[PDB]
RNA sequence: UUGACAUUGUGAAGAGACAUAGUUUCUUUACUUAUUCAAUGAAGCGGAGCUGGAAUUCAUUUUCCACGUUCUAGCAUUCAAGGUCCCAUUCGGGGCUGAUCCGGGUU
RNA sequence: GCUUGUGACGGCCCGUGAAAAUCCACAGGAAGGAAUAGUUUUCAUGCCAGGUCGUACUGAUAACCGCAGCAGGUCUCCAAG
RNA sequence: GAUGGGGAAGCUCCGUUUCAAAGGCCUGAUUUUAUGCAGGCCACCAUCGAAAGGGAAUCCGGUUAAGAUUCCGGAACCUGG
């Protein structure tokens, strides 16, 4: 693997020669939704901490 | 006289533990700021077979409090914990099959496994497949907690001492007959050099106390006193009774 | 005044001043003269009826070389002692504690000449 | 404000790697450190006797400074001065012919343990200074006791090396005096007076009190908030 | 194995004699500094304060609690972005703050 | 078809059947780089260099061990009709 | 199986990260000069131990009385610079 050219060890997408695409699919969606739901839980307990 | 088999297991030359394949030492997380003030999360990334242990282990990976990295733990998987699951460890942590909690922190009657004797000793009691300790109630001031170890004994230990919710997996393994010599053979092949065993009374006086005589018999009480000397303690050591257990045992 | 601040739990060795060595008598008065000069490197020419068959039909010199010497030392001293140039060197140890050498000369030179220049045949 | 943002950091368990702090209190010191530290500790925990612990009662910066002042006016000869005395008395006295006394009488601080102690015994010392360091403490502990019995004023100064400098050594343990040029003779008694205040007179009263017995703060604080609750309901 | 003596110190309740003053001796139970057991690339201990808040106020607090993370098999590092102050305005770079004080007993 | 190699699978276990060097990628974005001229030596092509020791042959009804040119013993690969 | 240690009258025994202040790289700092301090990493704690385990890279033809994946011819490949 050190006697061969860089594009024998990657596919062009992020996390190339590391994870299996369908696996990258997941960490995208999970990341977004969570960082989104991490925000849904901002207001909700901003509201409990100002109206209980 | 020779030196009897059960003396030679001491300098353990062929008598040690067959240790090559074992996944590592099963131990609780070291007890730090997280667990003793709050809680912390890990993911069980794998539960796997240990060679020479009846119960599955669970590999449970965490973050590091004080450096950017990961830290990886070997737990004994309490029955039900699963890959991907989240695991919590600490004082203010929850009551679910798999988290680790100070003994004070669980309502009396809970069920915990791999539980410390002294806090922070990182695991100690109820670790075999199927075993657990039940809690029978706490002592508010001087923070103790009385429990019932699998042997039925009732020991009192710290409430800061940690346990983990549930019974241990792989239970009931021993309800199944080993059936032939071979399965026994392999069983102990991965454990240590104890099998097979040769009835003392099959050998010669050199070899044993039970050894010798024109008939295969023991010749004297096979109940040997506590304060016996190495070379003597063979047979039923220090027994306070003997004979077929009639009636209901069970702890009181 | 006030104290120090250690950001690390660990206490390492005070990386202090390691000083030079400056004598007062000499190591050894008079140093040793070069132990393996060219003349001690290659010792004798090997003159088998099959050693010449190498020189004749192969452009290959043969030498009994001092065991204490490698290829780098043979090639340089074959060069220096015979004013020639070497293609490659093969060495073996003979079953009597002597180190043979199958020296080979570049496409230019002719061993045979170079052989009975030094005077053997 | 411009293209810049503010998004602090949640250092609160289970998130965000802890920032580097001053772990100064939690460092695994070298064993040689532990030893000198815990020896200090060990020394304070016990109930140290009155023939010792009657040390720990040093002088004070004020009264001491005045004694370091007055005693510097009586340093011993340096190498220079003595060799200089030599030739100013070599050719001088060996030719000019004096009774070896074309040379002045010197007025200087006496020192060196065995020196000072013969002095106290001959009632000739007039003010003795005692170190508070001396790790072989048995070398000097009998000096306060002695001075009192020989009716001689004394005081335990802070520093064994500080005494040293005013005598041209590294360390001197004890300095003392028998001579004093009459220019100073008066300021001396104004020193000896305050000296006899904090030491020579307090000595008998001092011999009754056992030092130490002090708790570590984690302990004192524990007990301070327990002998507080069992009494005030 | 079981006793005594040494290692062996410091408190209090109760007893033991000169025969109902405390120098001394033990039954019970406290102290940490000797000794012993454990843990960790000695990481957050102990004391005080902020904040809230359960608390009921018997002049104001007479107190006890807490005092950043829980639908998801993601991400979490460059003394940190922010704020603010300096170096004589370079690119670079330093304090303080962000991260409450006090004691240096790692727990 | 024989031998061997390899695959996708299936049975088996209170047995679930090594470790280390080493090599690759990845996340990360400290940095460093363009218009009159930079960036590239994981693309191609070109240059020098690779030391030391073993290397014969026997491996057995005679090259090993059995007092020996001993009907004994002594790990293994290839294997036609 | 050395080391810091701890045992042992002692030959030695114990322990291998263990009650130890254990150690070294990427480069910046020189433009008195060769290598100190400046950063920041790393706390990795010896070493020996497989010619059947792990493992960078070679092939065909020709040649000797006896060597050859080793020489010769020809065609490759790996590592370091
Ligand atoms: Mg590709
Ligand atoms: Mg073992
Ligand atoms: Mg056996
Ligand atoms: Mg049997
Ligand atoms: Mg028999
Ligand atoms: Mg017998
Ligand atoms: Mg018997
Ligand atoms: Mg018998
Ligand atoms: Mg029988
Ligand atoms: Mg060779
Ligand atoms: Mg076959
Ligand atoms: Mg499998
Ligand atoms: Mg290239
Ligand atoms: Mg080299
Ligand atoms: Mg051969
Ligand atoms: Mg033969
Ligand atoms: Mg034979
Ligand atoms: Mg050894
Ligand atoms: Mg090796
Ligand atoms: Mg191999
Ligand atoms: Mg051939
Ligand atoms: Mg030949
Ligand atoms: Mg052959
Ligand atoms: Mg190259």
Curated annotation (Swiss-Prot), chain A:
It comes from the Eukaryota. Coiled coil: none annotated. It is found in: Cytoplasm. Present with 23600 molecules/cell in log phase SD medium. Component of the large ribosomal subunit (LSU). Mature yeast ribosomes consist of a small (40S) and a large (60S) subunit. The 40S small subunit contains 1 molecule of ribosomal RNA (18S rRNA) and 33 different proteins (encoded by 57 genes). The large 60S subunit contains 3 rRNA molecules (25S, 5.8S and 5S rRNA) and 46 different proteins (encoded by 81 genes). Belongs to the eukaryotic ribosomal protein eL34 family. Component of the ribosome, a large ribonucleoprotein complex responsible for the synthesis of proteins in the cell. The small ribosomal subunit (SSU) binds messenger RNAs (mRNAs) and translates the encoded message by selecting cognate aminoacyl-transfer RNA (tRNA) molecules. The large subunit (LSU) contains the ribosomal catalytic site termed the peptidyl transferase center (PTC), which catalyzes the formation of peptide bonds, thereby polymerizing the amino acids delivered by tRNAs into a polypeptide chain. This is Large ribosomal subunit protein eL34A. The lineage of its organism: Eukaryota, Fungi, Dikarya, Ascomycota, Saccharomycotina. The chain holds residues 62 to 113 of 121 of the full protein.
UniProtKB/Swiss-Prot annotation, chain B:
GO terms for cellular component: cytosol; cytosolic large ribosomal subunit. There is a cross-link at residues 45, 92, 118, 144 (Glycyl lysine isopeptide (Lys-Gly) (interchain with G-Cter in ubiquitin)). InterPro entries: NA-bd_OB-fold (IPR012340), Rib_uL2_dom2 (IPR014722), Ribosomal_uL2 (IPR002171), Ribosomal_uL2_C (IPR022669), Ribosomal_uL2_CS (IPR022671), Ribosomal_uL2_dom3 (IPR014726), Ribosomal_uL2_RNA-bd_dom (IPR022666), Translation_prot_SH3-like_sf (IPR008991). The keyword Cell cycle does not apply. GO terms for molecular function: RNA binding; rRNA binding; structural constituent of ribosome. Gene3D superfamilies: 2.30.30.30, Nucleic acid-binding proteins (2.40.50.140), Ribosomal protein L2, domain 3 (4.10.950.10). It is found in: Cytoplasm. There are 2 genes for uL2 in yeast. This is Large ribosomal subunit protein uL2A. It comes from Saccharomyces cerevisiae (strain ATCC 204508 / S288c). The gene is RPL2A.
From Swiss-Prot, chain C:
It is found in: Cytoplasm. Coiled coil: none annotated. Keywords: Cytoplasm, Isopeptide bond, Ribonucleoprotein, Ribosomal protein, RNA-binding, rRNA-binding, Ubl conjugation. GO terms for biological process: cytoplasmic translation; ribosomal large subunit assembly. The keyword Zinc-finger does not apply. InterPro entries: Nucleotide-bd_a/b_plait_sf (IPR012677), Ribosomal_uL23-like (IPR013025), Ribosomal_uL23/eL15/eS24_sf (IPR012678), Ribosomal_uL23_CS (IPR001014), Ribosomal_uL23_N (IPR005633). Its main location: cytoplasm. One of its GO terms (molecular function) is rRNA binding. One of its GO terms (cellular component) is cytosol. There is a cross-link at residue 40 (Glycyl lysine isopeptide (Lys-Gly) (interchain with G-Cter in SUMO)). Belongs to the universal ribosomal protein uL23 family. Component of the large ribosomal subunit (LSU). Mature yeast ribosomes consist of a small (40S) and a large (60S) subunit. The 40S small subunit contains 1 molecule of ribosomal RNA (18S rRNA) and 33 different proteins (encoded by 57 genes). The large 60S subunit contains 3 rRNA molecules (25S, 5.8S and 5S rRNA) and 46 different proteins (encoded by 81 genes). uL23 is associated with the polypeptide exit tunnel. NCBIfam families: PRK14548.1 (NF011118). HAMAP family: Ribosomal_uL23_A (MF_01369_A). This is Large ribosomal subunit protein uL23. It comes from Saccharomyces cerevisiae (strain ATCC 204508 / S288c) (Baker's yeast). The gene is RPL25.
Curated annotation (Swiss-Prot), chain D:
The gene is RPL8A. InterPro entries: eL8/uL1-like (IPR050257), Ribosomal_eL30-like_sf (IPR029064), Ribosomal_eL8-like_CS (IPR004037), Ribosomal_eL8/eL30/eS12/Gad45 (IPR004038), Ribosomal_eL8/Nhp2 (IPR018492), Ribosomal_eL8_euk (IPR001921). Component of the ribosome, a large ribonucleoprotein complex responsible for the synthesis of proteins in the cell. The small ribosomal subunit (SSU) binds messenger RNAs (mRNAs) and translates the encoded message by selecting cognate aminoacyl-transfer RNA (tRNA) molecules. The large subunit (LSU) contains the ribosomal catalytic site termed the peptidyl transferase center (PTC), which catalyzes the formation of peptide bonds, thereby polymerizing the amino acids delivered by tRNAs into a polypeptide chain. One of its GO terms (molecular function) is structural constituent of ribosome. Belongs to the eukaryotic ribosomal protein eL8 family. SUPFAM superfamilies: L30e-like. One of its GO terms (cellular component) is cytosolic large ribosomal subunit. It comes from the Eukaryota. Its main location: cytoplasm. This is Large ribosomal subunit protein eL8A. It comes from Saccharomyces cerevisiae (strain ATCC 204508 / S288c) (Baker's yeast). GO terms for biological process: cytoplasmic translation; maturation of LSU-rRNA.
């Amino acid at each position: 693997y050190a006697t061969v050219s860089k594009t024998h060890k990657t596919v062009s997408r992020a996390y190339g020669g590391s994870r299996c695409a369908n696996c990258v699919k997941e960490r995208i969606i999970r990341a977004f939704l969570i960082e989104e739901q991490k925000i849904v839980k901002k207001v909700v307990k901003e509201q409990t901490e100002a109206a209980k | 006289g020779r030196v009897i088999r059960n003396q030679r297991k001491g300098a353990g030359s062929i008598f040690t533990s067959h240790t090559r394949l074992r996944q590592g030492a099963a131990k609780l997380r070291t007890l730090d700021y997280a667990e003793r003030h709050g809680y912390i999360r890990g993911i069980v990334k794998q539960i796997v077979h240990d060679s020479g242990r009846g119960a599955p282990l669970a590999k449970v990976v965490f973050r590091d409090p004080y450096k950017y990295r990961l830290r990886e733990e070997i737990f004994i998987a309490n029955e039900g914990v699963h890959t991907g699951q989240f695991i919590y460890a600490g004082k203010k942590a929850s009551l679910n099959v798999g988290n680790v909690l100070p003994l004070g922190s669980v309502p009396e009657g809970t069920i915990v496994s791999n539980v410390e004797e002294k806090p922070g000793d990182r695991g100690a009691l109820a670790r075999a497949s199927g075993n657990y300790v039940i809690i029978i109630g706490h002592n508010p001031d001087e923070n103790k907690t009385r429990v019932r170890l699998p042997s039925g004994a009732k020991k009192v230990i710290s409430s800061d001492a940690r346990g983990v919710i549930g019974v241990i997996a792989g239970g009931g393994r021993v309800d199944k007959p080993l059936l032939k010599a071979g399965r026994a053979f392999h069983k102990y092949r991965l454990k240590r050099n104890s099998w097979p065993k040769t009835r003392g009374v099959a050998m010669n006086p050199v070899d044993h106390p039970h050894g010798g005589g024109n008939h295969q018999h023991i010749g004297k009480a096979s109940t040997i006193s506590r304060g016996a000397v190495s070379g003597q303690k063979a047979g039923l050591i220090a027994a306070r009774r003997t004979g077929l257990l009639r009636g209901s045992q069970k702890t009181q | 005044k006030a104290l120090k601040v250690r950001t690390s739990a660990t206490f390492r060795l005070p990386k202090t001043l390691k000083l030079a060595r400056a004598p007062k008598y000499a190591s050894k008065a008079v140093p040793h003269y070069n132990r393996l000069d060219s003349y001690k490197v290659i010792e004798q020419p090997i003159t088998s009826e099959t050693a010449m068959k190498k020189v004749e039909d192969g452009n290959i010199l043969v030498f009994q070389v001092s065991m204490k010497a490698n290829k780098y030392q043979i090639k340089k001293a074959v060069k220096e002692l015979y004013e020639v140039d070497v293609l490659k060197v093969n060495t073996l140890v003979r079953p009597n504690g002597t180190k043979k050498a199958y020296v080979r000369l570049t496409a230019d030179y002719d061993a045979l000449d170079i052989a009975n220049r030094i005077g053997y045949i | 404000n411009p293209l810049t943002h503010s998004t602090p950091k949640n250092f609160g368990i289970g998130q965000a790697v802890q920032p580097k702090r001053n772990l100064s209190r939690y460092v695994k010191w070298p064993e040689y450190v532990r030893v000198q530290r815990q020896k200090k500790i060990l020394s304070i925990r016990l109930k140290v006797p009155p023939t010792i612990a009657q040390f720990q009662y040093t002088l004070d910066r004020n009264t001491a400074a005045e004694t370091f002042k007055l005693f510097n006016k009586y340093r011993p000869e340096t190498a220079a001065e003595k060799k200089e005395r030599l030739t100013k008395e070599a050719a001088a006295v060996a030719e000019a012919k004096s009774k070896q006394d074309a040379s002045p009488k010197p007025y200087a601080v006496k020192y060196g343990l065995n020196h000072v102690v013969a002095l106290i015994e001959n009632k000739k010392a007039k003010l003795v200074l005692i170190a508070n360091d001396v790790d072989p403490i048995e070398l000097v502990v009998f000096l306060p006791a002695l001075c009192k019995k020989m009716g001689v004023p004394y005081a335990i100064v802070k520093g064994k090396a500080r005494l040293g400098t005013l005598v041209n050594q590294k360390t001197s343990a004890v300095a003392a005096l028998t001579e004093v040029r009459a220019e100073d003779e008066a300021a001396l008694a104004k020193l000896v007076s305050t000296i006899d205040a904090n030491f020579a007179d307090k000595y008998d009263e001092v011999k009754k009190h056992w030092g130490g017995g002090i708790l570590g703060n984690k302990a004192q604080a524990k007990m301070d908030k327990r002998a507080k609750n069992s009494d005030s309901a």
